[PDB]
Structure formats: C-alpha cells, structure tokens
Amino acid sequence: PSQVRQNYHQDAEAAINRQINLELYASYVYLSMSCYFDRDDVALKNFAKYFLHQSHEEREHAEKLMKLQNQRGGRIFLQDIKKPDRDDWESGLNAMECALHLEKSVNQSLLELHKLATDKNDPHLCDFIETYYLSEQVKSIKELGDHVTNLRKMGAPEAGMAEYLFDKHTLG
C-alpha cells in the first residue's frame, strides 16, 4: 500500500482508470472529426478548429485524472484506446450530433463515478468530480445542443450555405 493512501477504495481506483480510458477515447473521436473537416471535399476550417480544440481539452481532462490517481496513491493502468466508430462524419450537423451523444455518454460515466464515491464515503473524490468534471460537462452538452438547434433551423445539411455560414458566424 502507498504511503499516501487514505480513504481510497480499490473500486474507486478501478473506476478512475476506466474514466481515463474514456477521456482518451473522446480525445481520439474529436481528432477523427477534426481531420474530416480538413478534407478538400469538406473544407470547413472552423469546424476542424473547433473539434481539434475539443480533442486537446479531453486530453487535459485525462491528464488531470491521472494526476488525481497519483495524488491519492492509486496506480494508473492504461488500456488500448479504441478507434472511433466512423472515419466519415457525413456533415457538420452529423458531427455535432455525434459529439452531443459522446458528451452525454461521458457525463453518464462521471455520474456513475460520483455515485460510487458517495457510496464509499470518499468526499475528496466527490468534490474533485463536481469541481472539475460535472460543471464542465453540463456547459459542453448545452453548447452542442445550441449548435445542433441552430444548424437544423438554418436547414443543414441540405442547405449548402447553412454549414458555410455557421462556420463563419458561430465558429469563426
């Protein structure tokens, strides 16, 4: 047992390892989306910039959980990062809808983690999740819902100027 370990259940250590994998997976999905919008047959630079920013943010989320695991005296066990479900993301609207789905799935994972920390009476870990993860997920899910709403009303993907003008106005 680590000299620093105190009130850190083996189940919490295991759940934090699963979450690190999921944040690294989310980072890979966003990178896949970023490089789709950089294709010459798609060519939406501000969609590509937006998803690359999200990819980097998710890597910072993963790295902060790795820091937490080490501060609490747990041990990081890394696993394969699975390839994303698509190479071709079809449209700006479809990628925003898939990003929304991914962010809600990551949020559900964190709520299951908070529930585990509550059941194991781990107040430091509960507060860590609330402070740096849950606040930020609610704000992300709302941003993506807003983007989806706006793109559907402008008539994306069938309206050719919808994603062009969204790329300049909302994402530019």
72: DSSP letter: T
- What secondary structure letter does DSSP report for 157? T
Would you say 62 and 23 are in contact if contact means Cβ atoms under 8 Å apart?
A: yes
DSSP conformational letter for 130: I
Considering only residues 114 through 143, tell me which ones interact with a second copy, judged by CB under 8 A. Answer: 114-115, 118, 121, 123-124, 126-131, 134-135, 138-139, 141-142
77 vs 132, beta carbon nearer Zn ion: 132
Residue 61 binds Zn ion (CB under 5 A): yes
The contact pattern for Zn ion, residues 15-44, with x = CB under 5 A and - = no contact, is --------x---------------------
Helix axis angle, 45-71 to 10-37, nearest 10°: 160
Beta strands in 47-97 (DSSP E): none
- Give, in order, the Cα–Cα distances in Å from 37 to each of 43, 46, 52, 126: 6, 8, 10, 37
Is residue 145 within the footprint of a second copy (CB under 8 A)? yes
- Out of 19, 102, 148, 171, point to the residue binding a second copy (CB under 8 A): 148
Hey, which residues between 80 and 109 contact a second copy (CB under 8 A)? 80-84, 87, 100, 104, 107-108
Out of 9, 49, 73, 120, the only residue in the binding site for a second copy (CB under 8 A) is 73
72 belongs to the binding site for Zn ion (CB under 5 A): no
Q: Which tokens is 40 given?
A: 């010459």
Annotation-wise, does 163 bind a ligand? no
101 marked as part of a ligand binding site: no
